[PDB]
Amino acid sequence: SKGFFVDTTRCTACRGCQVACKQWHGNPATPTENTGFHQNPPDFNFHTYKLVRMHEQEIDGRIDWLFFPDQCRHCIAPPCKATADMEDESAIIHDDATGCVLFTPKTKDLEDYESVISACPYDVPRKVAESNQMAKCDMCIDRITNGLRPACVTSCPTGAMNFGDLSEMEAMASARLAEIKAAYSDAKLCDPDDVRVIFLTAHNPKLYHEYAVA
Amino acid sequence: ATMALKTVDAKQTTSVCCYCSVGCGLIVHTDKKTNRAINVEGDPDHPINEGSLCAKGASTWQLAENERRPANPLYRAPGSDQWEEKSWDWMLDTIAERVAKTREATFVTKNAKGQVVNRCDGIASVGSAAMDNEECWIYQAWLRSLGLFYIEHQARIXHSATVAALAESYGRGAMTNHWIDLKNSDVILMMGSNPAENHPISFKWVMRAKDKGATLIHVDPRYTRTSTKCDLYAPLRSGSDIAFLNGMTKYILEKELYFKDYVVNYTNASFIVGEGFAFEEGLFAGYNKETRKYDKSKWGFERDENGNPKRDETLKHPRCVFQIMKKHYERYDLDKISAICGTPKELILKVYDAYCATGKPDKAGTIMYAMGWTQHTVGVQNIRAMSINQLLLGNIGVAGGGVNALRGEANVQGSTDHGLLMHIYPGYLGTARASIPTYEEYTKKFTPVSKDPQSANWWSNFPKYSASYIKSMWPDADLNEAYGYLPKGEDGKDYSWLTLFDDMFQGKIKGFFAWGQNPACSGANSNKTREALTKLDWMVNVNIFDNETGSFWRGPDMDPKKIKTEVFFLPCAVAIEKEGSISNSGRWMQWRYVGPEPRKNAIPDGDLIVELAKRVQKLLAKTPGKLAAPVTKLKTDYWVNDHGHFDPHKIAKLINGFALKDFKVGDVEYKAGQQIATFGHLQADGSTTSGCWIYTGSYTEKGNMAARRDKTQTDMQAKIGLYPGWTWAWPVNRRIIYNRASVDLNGKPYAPEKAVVEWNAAEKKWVGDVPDGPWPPQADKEKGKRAFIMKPEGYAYLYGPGREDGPLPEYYEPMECPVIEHPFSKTLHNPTALHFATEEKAVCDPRYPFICSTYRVTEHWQTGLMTRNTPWLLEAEPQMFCEMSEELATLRGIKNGDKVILESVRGKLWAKAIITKRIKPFAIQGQQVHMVGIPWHYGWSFPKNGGDAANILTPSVGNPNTGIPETKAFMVNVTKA
Ligand SMILES: Nc1nc2c(c(=O)[nH]1)N[C@H]1C(S)=C(S)[C@@H](COP(=O)(O)OP(=O)(O)OC[C@H]3O[C@@H](n4cnc5c(=O)[nH]c(N)nc54)[C@H](O)[C@@H]3O)O[C@H]1N2
Ligand SMILES: Nc1nc2c(c(=O)[nH]1)N[C@H]1[C@@H](S)[C@H](S)[C@@H](COP(=O)(O)OP(=O)(O)OC[C@H]3O[C@@H](n4cnc5c(=O)[nH]c(N)nc54)[C@H](O)[C@@H]3O)O[C@H]1N2
Ligand code: SF4
Ligand code: SF4
Ligand code: SF4
Ligand code: SF4
Ligand SMILES: [Ca+2]
Ligand SMILES: [W+6]
């Protein structure tokens, strides 16, 4: 089974991953305006699975700018599916070989989509306007079962994004945390035991995103 | 598993990103039935990006597969308010007629002073770094055959200062090292740049250096995406950089942190300066206060019996460059720098200490800077200061060192190499002027002489390059006659972007090519630039999308009925639909291939040029007018295949050059028709062509070096990441120029762990990189040469007497307003600048109290034409914005995201406020100076609510009303809308 290690301390917010995800999946741009921030769109939507979140933060009297390239965590025991399964076990596929949590178009037939979205501790899944269909990151399932890495990972220039077998990614995350713990005494991994997409932050996770950890 | 990839049966080709100068490789997948791209992503095997791409490269598919690309040529008639679609044949023949008639009407054979100039004064051209090398070369060739002298593009604006400064210091204007080499740096100083946003993939290598223990430093008035990764971030007031840099020079000299052996061996520190040199209260000797120019002869070196500069290698002589430097820099103490820059002394000292530690022989510091101020009277000396500091620390020619003067566009290096600037032909050969009537006088003027046999003085080869360039254009003419075909500029007249638009405004320019540029957004003072376009009888605009320039006649406040200009809009191909080369910031010339076909019915530039040139040649062949020869004799057959179409392989071979007749050079024999193997073999007698001599060696009898994808490296090469088998770098594949300075006089590396070159005594050859100068080590007095082979004596210039504003950098205040005095001398502003109030006190209008700067964001490109028309990028940065401090926002009652109006004396525009802690006011002399910032990526043509050009607010760099924008600092007001 697969995993990701996302080292936010190496992200330059180049937005290569955000665009790359759209390019690979054929996702359209969605309506935005500038409301006083460089981050856009403001949040995940049906057509946007990878979102580079950007937050200015004054830390120890000095300005910093914290980046979080958000996407589904591919929870080891996915609550979105657990909920959806009460209605239709074929709506959200849990792929044994990769660990991918795959929202399918079958979500359109769910009578209770709200409960599926609220079950996500990370507030990730999104519904298209015209129906109950929902979508989110598909771990680039087609690429990863065809000898390629995810589009966002391939696109990333600084090694912030990493992909591989879960164990290797878990080990990588731990080692990287160890390397900065001294200097960044508030650094931590975000729910490292519960998810497949593991983010390292150098400060309180909530300074990166309100839903960074469960 | 089961899942098929969207790409399985697609044609797979390679390309190189068409945005910035990093040179990232791409892989393109094209549907074999539709001939359209179905995927565009990074090439995992490319050594620079390893498949990574920033937002811009990643969005490439959307650039090509774009419904906003006009499918057909568009014509706008005089006074009309709408485009009319026309056939390619109608457009091409009509343009040909306009070019022929307008050329004839404005062509000067003999000027009023009686000089033969053979010059067309009524047609001008801008563009473009967006074109392939092979397109750029035939474009300048065509334009010159027409007699044009007004030939400019991108490079004039952001890299002209760099070329001037670095050529003075090192002998060439190019970036000295290359992208991958950044990983070898011990300290990376990013100053006057923002590489994480503007050269994003560079951060792969910058972060690899950091992983190795490197210190990363960013010095910028704003905290940016780059700043987030740096060990040291230092804010400094706009335009105060010279103080910061000269303070570093003082620190280096006084603390003896310089690398003495390197300074003695490879710089002009030992040169004895003549008794005429002096400096007093801000003025060097020789200042003429009425002309505001210096008599530079006052600054020359004292010469020996042979006419070579005298040297004191002990560096003790009171007039040696070194001692003159010690004296000159003593005034730049830290307290003064902190006061004028606004940067805390403690932080300056941290930067100095960290950076100056690289003066060790086995350490390397690099400086990454990009545009800097556009005013040369601010920019040139700032780059000189950086260059000086690098020489004192032994950082030039070594791995992880250099002045990494980052290029802008993907092929701005190439468009500069190919002479799309008024003052140079391809290969950096000065353009003919009215007072140079014959070819013999031309070669005599431009061929430097040194009587010192230890100096390579490589430009002594000039006549080989001029002959070869001239023959590449008119191979059947003799050189004297062909030289006369080249248009000659009026003596002392500027034909650059600086004045091209002023002259257009004054009615002097009748026809204009806006070829792959958007001057209605990119030129200073857009309101006036846009009005200047109305003075034109015709304009040919060649671009991917309709835009602010091609459709200027329907822009803001324009009444189409009152605009007489005929506009021909020719939709062109995008990069992944083209085959040719582009040269990156590291001088890597990279071959690209067609993926999807040119989207119907767009045409690639090369073919557009071929079609126009041939039609114009046929008109002049039937009706010659005053002087048909340069036009009809131009060898366009060299540019096309047997079917009459643009052939990039043929043009690239011409650029490289080939034998026109059999000849022998040394032990090498050439037969007519054979490609020349190196510029060292080119001939002064007319025996060879070469469109651009620096490219000789790129496409030889052994093939297309730019198409090579060989990752083989020796252990030595691999240690520093040269990848000499990957594509090809000019000159002659020397990846790190000035590399002879990375070794001692014996040829032994100063940094054995990251050596660039090393002399192999048993084989009489250099190993590692190609040596920048192949001769034996400098200790060999009989056969060896000095390190800086393009300089007249072989020594880099610390003291550089060629610069019009002084042989050493000196601080002057860059702006009139608000009035800020500086503590370094009684000379307030640069004494060679002409736009300042002198006799009177500056009169600063309170209507425009804030300083506004323009810069970029990662997601947009240039005027934004390309990226505003790319949905994924526009989604991320959808509107003009104004970044401002909390303090200023509070003062003006502005809240985050509010619409605000920016106004200057030139015009006004709206933006969305971005209140940020990343900008703070500067405090200088009891005064709180506020600077705000805006991007220059927007324009009225699209989208509807995106905003317009930042240049609506800007003035020029000088007395011009339009032209080169002073883009970094100008006065405005900001008000809540
Ligand atoms: N994403 C993107 N990349 C680009 C481009 C683009 O449009 N978008 N354009 C390309 C081109 S053509 C070019 S020439 C290069 C330009 O590349 P850069 O020069 O890096 O571009 P800017 O963003 O204009 O300016 C860089 C930094 O200079 C700072 N600055 C302003 N004034 C001063 C000063 O007085 N001193 C100092 N030390 N810093 C100052 C600004 O705050 C900014 O962060 O970028 C190229 N790359
Ligand atoms: N206030 C302010 N002003 C500034 C600057 C600033 O920082 N501040 N920057 C200055 C610099 S450094 C640059 S290089 C210059 C660029 O202007 P320009 O080339 O008109 O932009 P562009 O037109 O947007 O980009 C180049 C064009 O290339 C087209 N293109 C791209 N590919 C091709 C091709 O294959 N063929 C052809 N013919 N064209 C192609 C783009 O569409 C774009 O218009 O703008 C200066 N101005
Ligand atoms: S992050 Fe949310 S949407 Fe993604 S697997 Fe976990 S519960 Fe489901
Ligand atoms: S794994 Fe694939 S689907 Fe998920 S965020 Fe990255 S690019 Fe998008
Ligand atoms: S591609 Fe990498 S560096 Fe760029 S925004 Fe995404 S995670 Fe950050
Ligand atoms: S814009 Fe520059 S850094 Fe980004 S993908 Fe293109 S060449 Fe690479
Ligand atoms: Ca050094
Ligand atoms: W530029």
Swiss-Prot record, chain A:
Keywords from the UniProt entry: 4Fe-4S, Electron transport, Iron, Iron-sulfur, Metal-binding, Periplasm, Repeat, Transport
Disulfide bonds: none
Record carries keyword Ion transport: no
Cofactor binding note of this UniProt entry: Binds 3 [4Fe-4S] clusters.
Gene3D superfamilies per UniProt: 3.30.70.20
Binding site for [4Fe-4S] cluster 3: C72, C75, C80, C120
Residues engaged in binding [4Fe-4S] cluster 1: C11, C14, C17, C156
Domain annotation 4Fe-4S ferredoxin-type: ranges: 2-31, 128-167
One GO CC annotation: periplasmic space
Cofactor(s) listed: [4Fe-4S] cluster
Principal localisation: periplasm
GO MF terms held by the record: 4 iron, 4 sulfur cluster binding; metal ion binding
InterPro entries: 4Fe4S_Fe-S-bd, FDH_Electron_Transfer_Unit
Residues holding [4Fe-4S] cluster 2: C21, C137, C140, C152
Compartment(s) where it occurs, according to its Swiss-Prot or TrEMBL record: Periplasm
PANTHER family the UniProt entry points to: FORMATE DEHYDROGENASE, NITRATE-INDUCIBLE, IRON-SULFUR SUBUNIT, IRON-SULFUR PROTEIN
Function statement: Beta chain of the formate dehydrogenase (FDH) catalyzes the reversible two-electron oxidation of formate to carbon dioxide. FDH loses activity in the presence of air, but this activity can be restored. This chain is an electron transfer unit.
Assembly behavior: Heterodimer of alpha (FdhA) and beta (FdhB) subunits.
Name of the molecule in the record: Formate dehydrogenase subunit beta
Species, as recorded: Megalodesulfovibrio gigas (strain ATCC 19364 / DSM 1382 / NCIMB 9332 / VKM B-1759) (Desulfovibrio gigas)
Gene name for this UniProt entry: fdhB
From Swiss-Prot, chain B:
Binding site for Ca(2+): T358, K360, K363, L393, N395
Record note on modification: The disulfide bond is likely to be broken in the active form of this enzyme.
Predominant localisation class: periplasm
Activity's dependence on pH: Optimum pH is 7.5-8.0.
InterPro entries xrefs: Asp_de-COase-like_dom_sf, Formate-DH-alph_fdnG, MoPterin_dinucl-bd_dom, Mopterin_OxRdtase, Mopterin_OxRdtase_4Fe-4S_dom, Mopterin_OxRdtase_prok_CS, MopterinOxRdtase_cofactor_BS, TAT_signal
Residues annotated to bind W-bis(molybdopterin guanine dinucleotide): X158
Temperature behavior of the protein's activity: Optimum temperature is 56 degrees Celsius.
Cofactor dependency: [4Fe-4S] cluster; W-bis(molybdopterin guanine dinucleotide)
CDD domains: MopB_CT_Formate-Dh-Na-like, MopB_Formate-Dh-Na-like
Catalytic reactions on record: formate + NAD(+) = CO2 + NADH
Example GO biological process: anaerobic respiration
Annotated residues for binding of [4Fe-4S] cluster: C17, C20, C24, C54
Protein name as it appears in the record: Formate dehydrogenase subunit alpha
Organism: Megalodesulfovibrio gigas (Desulfovibrio gigas)
